[PDB]
Amino acid sequence: ITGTSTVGVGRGVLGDQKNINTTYSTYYYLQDNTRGDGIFTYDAKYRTTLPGSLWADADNQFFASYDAPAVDAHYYAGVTYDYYKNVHNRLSYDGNNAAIRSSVHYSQGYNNAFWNGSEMVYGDGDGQTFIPLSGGIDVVAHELTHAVTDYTAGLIYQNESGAINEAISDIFGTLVEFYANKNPDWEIGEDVYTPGISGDSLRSMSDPAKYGDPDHYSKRYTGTQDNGGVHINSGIINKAAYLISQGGTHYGVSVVGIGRDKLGKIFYRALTQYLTPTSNFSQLRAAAVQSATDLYGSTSQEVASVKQAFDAVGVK
Ligand SMILES: [Ca+2]
Ligand SMILES: [Ca+2]
Ligand SMILES: [Ca+2]
Ligand SMILES: [Ca+2]
Ligand SMILES: [Zn+2]
Structure with missing residues (x-):
C-alpha cells in the first residue's frame, strides 16, 4: 500500500507492549517501510489460502487478543532483518532487500509455523501444545533463516x-x-x-x-x-x-x-x-x-x- 509511515503500539502474544512500524492510508496497515522493500503482515483468518489480507487496523493501537500474533510476527521479522543487516551485512533474506511477508492465524488449531518458499506462515497453536507461534523470537528467526538458506546453500x-x-x-x-x-x-x-x-x-x-x-x-x-x-x-x-x-x-x-x-x-x-x-x-x-x-x-x-x-x- 502507498501511504505515510507511522508508528503504532500493541501487545504481543506474551502480553508485552511494543511499538511497531505501520503505514497509514485510510486504515493503519502492518507494513513497515523502514526495512528494505518492506515487512508486510497478513491475516489468513483461520483459512489456508495465502497470503490472506494485508493486516488493516482502524486506530493504530493493537491490543485486541486477535492482534497479538500479528504484532509479534511483524515485530520479530523486523528484529531478524536487523540482525542480518547489522551483524552479517546481509540485506533481507536474498541479500537484495526482498520484502518479508508473513501471514498469521493460518488454519485452526495449527501447531506449526513455516517458511513456504515465498513467505512465513504461523498457526495459532491449539492452546495446549502451543500458543500462537510468532510469540517465539527463536521460532520466527528459525523460519526466516530457512529463506536465507534457500537463497544461498540451497x-x-x-x-x-x-x-x-x-x-x-x-x-x-x-x-x-x-x-x-x-x-x-x-x-x-x-x-x-x-x-x-x-x-x-x-x-x-x-x-x-x-x-x-x-x-x-x-x-x-x-x-x-x-x-x-x-x-x-x-x-x-x-x-x-x-x-x-x-x-x-x-x-x-x-x-x-x-x-x-x-x-x-x-x-x-x-x-x-x-x-x-x-x-x-x-x-x-x-x-x-x-x-x-x-x-x-x-x-x-x-x-x-x-x-x-x-x-x-x-x-x-
Ligand atoms: Ca486497533
Ligand atoms: Ca512449556
Ligand atoms: Ca530459545
Ligand atoms: Ca528464551
Ligand atoms: Zn525448520
Whole structure:
C-alpha cells in the first residue's frame, strides 16, 4: 500500500507492549517501510489460502487478543532483518532487500509455523501444545533463516542436508534471540511451547538428548520419517554448535568455547560460501574448518575448537 509511515503500539502474544512500524492510508496497515522493500503482515483468518489480507487496523493501537500474533510476527521479522543487516551485512533474506511477508492465524488449531518458499506462515497453536507461534523470537528467526538458506546453500530438505538445514535455522534463531536479549537460552520454542508446563521446550541445543534427539553421530536416525530425520539428526549439529560457542566436555572430548559471535561468523561464512544443496555432515565439518581458517588462520584456537566440537559429536 502507498501511504505515510507511522508508528503504532500493541501487545504481543506474551502480553508485552511494543511499538511497531505501520503505514497509514485510510486504515493503519502492518507494513513497515523502514526495512528494505518492506515487512508486510497478513491475516489468513483461520483459512489456508495465502497470503490472506494485508493486516488493516482502524486506530493504530493493537491490543485486541486477535492482534497479538500479528504484532509479534511483524515485530520479530523486523528484529531478524536487523540482525542480518547489522551483524552479517546481509540485506533481507536474498541479500537484495526482498520484502518479508508473513501471514498469521493460518488454519485452526495449527501447531506449526513455516517458511513456504515465498513467505512465513504461523498457526495459532491449539492452546495446549502451543500458543500462537510468532510469540517465539527463536521460532520466527528459525523460519526466516530457512529463506536465507534457500537463497544461498540451497540445502535440500531431506537426510543429512535437511538436518543441516534445520540446525542452521536453530543456530541463527538462537543467535537472534541472544541479539534481542529476550531472556536468551540454547533451547528452541520455549516461549510458545506447552503453556501449562514450565521449563521445557521443543528441542535443546545444549543437551539434545533431553528430548530424545541424538547428540552423537553414532545415534543418528536412519529411517524415513520426518524426511529422513531432519528435525531429529539436527541435534548432532546443534550440539556441535553449542560446544563451539560455550565449550564443554562431551563423550570425553574437551572443547574450548570461542563464544557466540565467532560461532555466527563461522557458520554464516560456511553457509553463504561453501555449503551446496547436497552437503552432508562431513562436508559441513570441512566447510566450518575452512571458514574459521579463512577468518582466523589455520593455527588459531578457533579452528582448533571447530575441530574438537565435530570430533566430540563423532562427525569426521
Ligand atoms: Ca486497533
Ligand atoms: Ca528464551
Ligand atoms: Ca530459545
Ligand atoms: Ca512449556
Ligand atoms: Zn525448520
